[model samples]
Target: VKLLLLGAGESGKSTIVKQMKICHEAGYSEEECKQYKAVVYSNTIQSIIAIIRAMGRLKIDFGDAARADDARQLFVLAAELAGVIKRLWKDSGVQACFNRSREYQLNDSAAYYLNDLDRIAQPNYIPTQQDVLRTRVKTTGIVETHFTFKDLHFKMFDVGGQRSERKKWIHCFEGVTAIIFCVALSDYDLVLAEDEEMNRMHESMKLFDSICNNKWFTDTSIILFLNKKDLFEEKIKKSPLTICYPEYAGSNTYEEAAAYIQCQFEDLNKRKDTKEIYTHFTCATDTKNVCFVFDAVTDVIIKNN
Candidate 1:
């Protein structure tokens, strides 16, 4: 089975790859774990800094004038801190600000690793499986990984979903057995990093529609992964789904919001042949949940083949 994982940036495609390593291949080695420590710190600091800068530009203050000054200082120090994560990670102010990152609309993963600054900053620190899975690193190019399930050999391909990288996706479309299209369920309120004017979910929907209608993938089965369910649930409670998508008129409950998002993708299927698009709600960071979904996906793919 050969599966292609496609999604917008931060749509959880990379997280699924990390889960595959844990569930199928042996988990990361001690050395590999050590490598992710720097990445985790970098992601945490960068994400927090990005949000802080955004707030600064919008003149949105979390606390008082002091907090605004701190944010401005953080923005100027972001580059310096990005390079010296190991040296200043012990700063009490940095630790406290990271813990209160939610006030700035930074996601949960930022706080997850930042709250563990002491442990991660240790000289001999090695990331846990969960740590590596939760770490957010941008995928820049095509990454192919192979593993075997039972007697079936499978190859999983991950590609960059940014606007600049979408041009390269056509090269990988040939002979694809299945397309696992991932959409961030919690992205309704976020904008694309590359284009702030474009809503992240809106861009994902358009991409999903184009891929589904592509003639090359006509015979390939599509698997829709409504990923980041955990974040989706939390985000809906805090920020209304209607903010980015005003068309959403359903109750503000997670179930309604998720179903509404899934329906958007389902309504895009133009295939009229034997191909079927299977959809699953996924929290890519949760290993147990992802393993269960992949097991089901493997079964469906094998049976179809």
Candidate 2:
């Protein structure tokens, strides 16, 4: 059976696919893990660069004036990049820019990876699977994966979710058995990287409305992954949900906030719909949480098949 992973960019779509590779299939080998060293460092480097650029865009200044040379590590040796990154990461100006990261596009793991720059940039560093999952790389083309779960063999595809890339998805609809539509719960306050004029949550709602109501997906099990619950819980405490939905006047507690967001998607379905929607609260980077959710997902897919 075939399944599709769909979501807006930076919605943890790739991270979910990586979890499947780690948990369901043979996990990454030393050779595969070897390459993540560059990936991790690249994520760190670009995160700082994005923040520096945002500082200018937001008209913020460096907490430490001399740190620009460090922040401008663009011309520095690869070995010294880590030291520079660590210094700038702690700067109040950079931190202020990061607080507004939603205005511009920044990776979700920017904080996670930047916080651990010391060990990650070491000469003898080796990547763990967690490191690999936290590194952000944009999805450009379709990624297909196949694995067997006991008696069942499953095929899944993660197509690129950028606005420019959705046209490629038409070819993937032929034999789809399920569509795991992922949405970043923490993105309620963020705007899309492609169009700063549009909000990311609104983009997901619009994109999802078309896909969920598409004729091609009739009777196809629709799975909704409200991904990044961990981030949402933390973010909601500080950034209220009202930023996206101005009428939001409910408690900022995680349960109410999450249920409110879930309801917004659930409300998109037509009254005459026959397909059932399966959803899970997921933090795709956490293995134990996703492993259990996959089990629940497999049971639903098996029944539908």
Candidate 3:
């Protein structure tokens, strides 16, 4: 089954891709690995400093200020490039370690080390934001490669979440058996109102609507993964769909949140008569994981095919 994972940048799409190969015995091709590899490029002032701070070891020597008026600007670009290198090394090497982690027995140093990312940023920590801003010509495209599940050949397109680049996603829609549309239930603020605390629900719905309405895709089943549920109890403190909507504030548990989101989706889907959309609320960070999203996805794909 050919699957297109579509969502905004940093929406855990890449992590899901990596997790599949790691846990499913479906190894990614070096070429496919190249497709998932990317480096974020930006030159905004604050972003530059954040980039430098976020780097593993790279340092950008900001040259003396008196030499040129554009000196700081030039240095910021250079610093951003250095950050890109750090990000690439971590993503690639981390996946390599994740692959090796399986070789150990039940508990070992390598296994613990490989799973460290789960404790830190985990897999679905952030979603696509910077990707939506980078220019198409300059933005790196998400890679595509094939792997095997049993005897089934699964091809995955790590489609760019950058807004402009997503417009090109239609090309990947051909022959797709399933669509894993990951919308951050918690990141409703990626596009936000003045308060920031309140989700611009309409805006999120619009983004969701666009993906569902794409002309190239027709009746393909969609897996709507509402990731980052580990934070729900602490942060949301209420039902997901009803948290602030008054109509949804009383939901008791994660299953309730999942059902609420599903009902709300149905309300929207009914308007367009779209069917076969499945929703799951999961925490990719938690080791005793609530839902093995990769398994859920693979099951559906295998069954449908």
Candidate 4:
């Protein structure tokens, strides 16, 4: 199966690629384990600096005036990780700045590391496998990974999802068996980090519309992954789905919210004659969830062919 994973920026496409690797291939060695340890250090430090600078770039202020000390130390990216960060994270000012993070690009993967500061600060900690996959490195040109699943040969391709990278996608369309198109469920309230004006949720929909209705892959099935379900469940109560789809008339509960988002993607497919989109909810960090979804997706591919 030559499955192609495509989505807009930071929609967990690369995370899904890494998921299949851990499932079908061998685990990381000691060297590889420590390799990601260094990445945790860098991603953690850089994420703090990114948030600090974003404060000024967006003209947002920190809650505590003395919290300026935290920004000073964080800039001391020259400095080691900090208790100051843990303290500043609770600051009303830093909190205020992050509220508008959609306006400026803050790496969500980096935000994941930012939450683990107190735990990750310990020098002896070995980074977890999922933690390593959550690093802030962006996917470059078209990169392909190879593995075999249950005697079936699987070759998957991952492309950079940023707008500048879209033009190179044509080279990857041939020999593709299925498109595992990923969309971030937690993105309802956020705008694209690459294009601050466009909402991330809408961009995913627009791209899915074109790919779902395109003439090129008429025979291929679309495995629509509405990913980051765990994050969305937590975010929905505070930030309603109505933020993205203003006309949404449902209650603020997670069930109602996710159902609407799922239907929105399904409505994009005009090719209902052969097979419509195969939809699944995913949280890429969870091993059981990713493995389960992949098994279901492979079954769909096998049966369809």
- By summed lDDT, the worst window of 10 consecutive residues in model 1 runs over 79-88
Model 3 alpha-carbon miss at residue 277, Å: 1.2
* Candidate 1 residue-wise lDDT, 1-305, digit = tens: 77899999879898888888888888889888878877887777776675555554555445433444455565567633433443333445455454434344465587677567667656667889888888876789899999888787778999988899898898888989998999988788877878877888999999999998899987788899999898888878878888777978899999998888888888888874555778999999888899999999988877877
Off by over 4 Å in 3: 25-139, 189-202, 238-258, 270-274, 286-291
lDDT of 2: 0.86
Per-residue lDDT of model 3, residues 1-305, tens digit only: 78887765445566565556545553445444333323222222223233333332332232332322232343555533333333432443333433322122111112222233233232332322222212122224767868877677888887766546667776777788878776556553233423344354444455567766665556577777766454444434432344335566645565566566556654565325646667777654432342365666678766765
Better structure of 1 and 4 per TM-score: 4
TM-scores for all predictions: 0.85, 0.94, 0.55, 0.91
RMSD of 2: 1.7
Candidate number with the higher TM-score (1 or 3): 1
* lDDT, model 2, position 274: 74
Q: Write the per-residue lDDT of candidate 4 for residues 1-305, one digit (tens) a residue.
A: 89888999889998888788677776566567778887788877777677778888878887778877667876665523468778777788777777666566666676687788777778677877878778766888998888888787888999988788988888888788999999999888888877777888999999999888887799888999999898898789788788899999999999999999999999988867776789999988777889998899999888898
Clashes of 4: 3
Instruction: Score candidate 2 by TM-score against the native.
Output: 0.94
Residues 1-305, model 2: lDDT tens digits:
78899999888889999999888877788778879888887888778788888888888998888786886665455366667777888889989889887677787889998898887887888888899988888899899988888577788899899889999999999798889999999889988888877878989999888889898988788889999999998888888899889988898989998998998887887633576778789999998988899899989887877
Candidate 3: 10-residue stretch with minimal lDDT: 102-111
